Amino acid sequence: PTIGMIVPPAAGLVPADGARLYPDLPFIASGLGLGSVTPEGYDAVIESVVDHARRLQKQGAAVVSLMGTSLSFYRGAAFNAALTVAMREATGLPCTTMSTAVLNGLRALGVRRVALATAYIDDVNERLAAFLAEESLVPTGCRSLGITGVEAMARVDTATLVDLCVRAFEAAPDSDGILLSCGGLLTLDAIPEVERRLGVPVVSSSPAGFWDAVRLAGGGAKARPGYGRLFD
């Protein structure tokens, strides 16, 4: 089934991980035009999420994921659930969000104490921690990049991402796993290196978004190897 994705950047591309994780699967995307990875930024596009879900339905999507973590967590857990209900009601399609994806990924891996490694400024990190706590997880510490650029996220390199995850875990080595948050990051080469070095799993925004959306679509598709314990 064709999977539709609402993505933060204006360009509206399918996030790059899809072709690596699931080369055989069809994805389509619609771009919100988010201007900054900040609460003020989210407020300027959040009301258009329902319309973009409908656009994707009109293009033949059979499920829709809102592929933005902070866009979906910044107002707390209830709003993540409510926005999902709104999308479903507007389209009659199964819908999900990237915040739901990462929650599901951490749960699937049995992660309760979670170290945070993020691209964000601290206001956004505080909101992430509050969301996770509402959902019965225990954030243990946090290291972050403090980036507000949207398209800028794709340019953070692998070595930077590995170092970020390692530093986050170093701060709390009793953690069960690591949440690497920001769906604009290109994390697929970082994940196996971090898991190799540390011995704990990483749940990363974009790959968890794909994993969750493919689960939602129901076909039982398996990801290509080398992308983390989440993919078996």
Q: Which is nearer to ligand B85, 69 or 218 (CB)?
A: 69
Measure CA of the first residue to CA of the last residue in the chain; give whole Å. 22
Token output for 106? 């951490």
Q: Which is nearer to ligand B85, 82 or 170 (CB)?
A: 82
Residues that bind ligand B85 (CB under 6 A): 7-9, 37, 68-71, 98, 150, 153, 182-184, 205
Query: How far apart are CB 147 and ligand B85 at their closest, in Å?
Result: 9
Q: Which is nearer to ligand B85, 121 or 222 (CB)?
A: 121
Query: How far apart are CB 63 and ligand B85 at their closest, in Å?
Result: 19
Query: How far apart are CB 139 and ligand B85 at their closest, in Å?
Result: 15
Q: Which is nearer to ligand B85, 153 or 217 (CB)?
A: 153
- The angle that helices 158-171 and 190-198 make with each other, rounded to 10 degrees, is 30
Q: Between vectors from CA 71 to CA 102 and to CA 18, what angle results, nearest 5°?
A: 50
**Nearest CA to 180 among 136, 137, 145?**
145
Q: Which is nearer to ligand B85, 6 or 217 (CB)?
A: 6
The residue sitting closest to ligand B85, measured at its beta carbon, is 184
Q: How far apart are CA 50 and CA 40, in angstroms?
A: 19
Query: How far apart are CB 228 and ligand B85 at their closest, in Å?
Result: 17
Query: How far apart are CB 122 and ligand B85 at their closest, in Å?
Result: 14
Query: How far apart are CB 175 and ligand B85 at their closest, in Å?
Result: 20
Under a CB-based contact definition with an 8 Å cutoff, are residues 118 and 129 in contact?
A: no
Q: Which is nearer to ligand B85, 155 or 197 (CB)?
A: 155
Q: Is 56 left (phi over 0), alpha (psi -120 to 50) or beta?
A: alpha
